[PDB]
Design a binder for this molecule. Sequence first.
Ligand SMILES: Cc1cccc(OC[C@@H]2CCCC[C@@H]2C(=O)O)c1
Length: 134
Amino acid sequence: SHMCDAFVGTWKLVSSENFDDYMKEVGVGFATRKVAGMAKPNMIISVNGDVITIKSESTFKNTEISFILGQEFDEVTADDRKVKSTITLDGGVLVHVQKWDGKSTTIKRKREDDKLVVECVMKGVTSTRVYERA
Ligand SMILES: Cc1cccc(OC[C@@H]2CCCC[C@@H]2C(=O)O)c1
């Protein structure tokens, strides 16, 4: 057993707060905000050795990242940004920093009760997205 065991599984979005404002702060345009905001993604987290994979599937877009903690990688976001990402574990929380165009956003994923809580921060704006087991 290991690092991210409590994250592994298949998860479905059950609540979202302030996501439109988070996307505005990120720079996402009107039509993508509207369509992306409707999506109820399933997130599938798995671990194989040192490699963590996070897949997201939705009506809007499917995304997939595989990574080693602390090791920067290239990512294509659901809103089609091309970012440089680094994900670490800090006190049991996955901390994901995305850098692009001189900008930065941080996404934290943590286990809380039977939920997986995702907090997305861009400058002063946070969005909270809560997932339950599928
Ligand atoms: C695949 C897809 C479709 C539409 C929205 C979306 O948001 C992802 C959220 C923001 C970016 C960080 C992760 C968040 C999460 O809910 O895991 C993803």
